Design an enzyme around this catalytic site. Sequence first.
Site, PDB file in Angstrom:
ATOM      1  N   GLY A 190     -10.963   2.230   5.996  1.00 22.59           N
ATOM      2  CA  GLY A 190     -11.676   0.987   6.210  1.00 22.59           C
ATOM      3  C   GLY A 190     -12.587   0.649   5.045  1.00 22.59           C
ATOM      4  O   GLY A 190     -12.624   1.330   4.014  1.00 22.59           O
ATOM      5  N   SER A 213      -2.321   1.654  -4.970  1.00 24.29           N
ATOM      6  CA  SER A 213      -2.817   2.798  -4.225  1.00 24.29           C
ATOM      7  C   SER A 213      -4.157   3.241  -4.787  1.00 24.29           C
ATOM      8  O   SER A 213      -4.391   3.152  -5.994  1.00 24.29           O
ATOM      9  CB  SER A 213      -1.809   3.956  -4.275  1.00 24.29           C
ATOM     10  OG  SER A 213      -2.314   5.099  -3.606  1.00 24.29           O
ATOM     11  N   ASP A 236       0.851  -1.183   0.000  1.00 28.41           N
ATOM     12  CA  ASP A 236       0.000   0.000   0.000  1.00 28.41           C
ATOM     13  C   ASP A 236       0.891   1.238   0.000  1.00 28.41           C
ATOM     14  O   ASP A 236       2.035   1.183   0.449  1.00 28.41           O
ATOM     15  CB  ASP A 236      -0.913  -0.055   1.225  1.00 28.41           C
ATOM     16  CG  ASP A 236      -1.628   1.247   1.495  1.00 28.41           C
ATOM     17  OD1 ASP A 236      -2.229   1.843   0.574  1.00 28.41           O
ATOM     18  OD2 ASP A 236      -1.594   1.649   2.661  1.00 28.41           O
ATOM     19  N   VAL A 237       0.406   2.354  -0.561  1.00 31.24           N
ATOM     20  CA  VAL A 237       1.284   3.528  -0.633  1.00 31.24           C
ATOM     21  C   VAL A 237       1.034   4.478   0.541  1.00 31.24           C
ATOM     22  O   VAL A 237       1.894   4.624   1.423  1.00 31.24           O
ATOM     23  CB  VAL A 237       1.162   4.251  -1.991  1.00 31.24           C
ATOM     24  CG1 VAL A 237       2.020   5.508  -1.986  1.00 31.24           C
ATOM     25  CG2 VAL A 237       1.626   3.338  -3.138  1.00 31.24           C
ATOM     26  N   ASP A 238      -0.156   5.094   0.586  1.00 31.84           N
ATOM     27  CA  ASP A 238      -0.490   6.084   1.614  1.00 31.84           C
ATOM     28  C   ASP A 238      -0.376   5.495   3.022  1.00 31.84           C
ATOM     29  O   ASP A 238      -1.061   4.530   3.361  1.00 31.84           O
ATOM     30  CB  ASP A 238      -1.910   6.619   1.391  1.00 31.84           C
ATOM     31  CG  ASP A 238      -2.052   7.462   0.105  1.00 31.84           C
ATOM     32  OD1 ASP A 238      -1.061   8.017  -0.403  1.00 31.84           O
ATOM     33  OD2 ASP A 238      -3.189   7.599  -0.389  1.00 31.84           O
ATOM     34  N   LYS A 242      -7.856  -3.195  -4.569  1.00 32.60           N
ATOM     35  CA  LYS A 242      -6.567  -3.828  -4.295  1.00 32.60           C
ATOM     36  C   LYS A 242      -6.639  -5.336  -4.491  1.00 32.60           C
ATOM     37  O   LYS A 242      -5.704  -5.942  -5.037  1.00 32.60           O
ATOM     38  CB  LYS A 242      -6.101  -3.494  -2.880  1.00 32.60           C
ATOM     39  CG  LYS A 242      -5.643  -2.047  -2.733  1.00 32.60           C
ATOM     40  CD  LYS A 242      -5.313  -1.679  -1.289  1.00 32.60           C
ATOM     41  CE  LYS A 242      -4.777  -0.236  -1.210  1.00 32.60           C
ATOM     42  NZ  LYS A 242      -4.781   0.291   0.194  1.00 32.60           N
TER      43      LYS A 242
HETATM   44 CA   LIG Z   1      -2.925   3.215   3.437  1.00 27.81          CA
END
Ligand SMILES: [Ca+2]
Length: 220
Positions: free
Chosen positions: A49, A105, A16-18, A154
């Site tokens: 979430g 992302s 995951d990026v963020d 994702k």
């Molecule tokens: Ca994240």
Amino acid sequence: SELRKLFYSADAVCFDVDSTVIREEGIDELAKICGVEDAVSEMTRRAMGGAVPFKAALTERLALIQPSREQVQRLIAEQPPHLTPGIRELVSRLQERNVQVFLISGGFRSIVEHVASKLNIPATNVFANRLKFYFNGEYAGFDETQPTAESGGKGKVIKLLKEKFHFKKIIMIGDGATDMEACPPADAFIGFGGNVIRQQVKDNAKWYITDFVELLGELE
Ligand SMILES: [Ca+2]
Ligand SMILES: [Ca+2]
């Protein structure tokens, strides 16, 4: 240790990026550059979430921001995101072991590809949303046919990677519920709380780390 055996058995790792690869949330940084940090920042939290339809939440957030191309350029040039400590070294160890590394992302390709270059991750290995602009540079929307544009995106990316490359052990690494929700189809999930602990993830993940060093399994 047992986590090290797991991590070493992967032939692909998706980050995951963020709040995982970088300290920030890419869309909140863009909102800062465009002057509406306050509203968008809480809209982003509100979506964290498996909480709301992602695509609607992204339309509303971008409708407040209205990012121009030159504003995206200024963000990349003048306020680039901060890589989480350890991630440079972690991806280097992975690439030296021929593990395929991907970035996935709900943020935007222009920013995420900038992050990938710093990590020697080819752009083919980046899956993100794509902003659209008019000829003069004005915000024109985003590509809604991207898997990352929809809830569950994702998981859809990882499924596409399995069909294309037939990886035997794909691990998803990320900080939030939507990352944990990508396993399955991922083979394992490792929660990440180095930037912010999401207790809901930490309580329910089999694997959870707070420091990217912990996966460095032989001190070299
Ligand atoms: Ca994240
Ligand atoms: Ca799933």
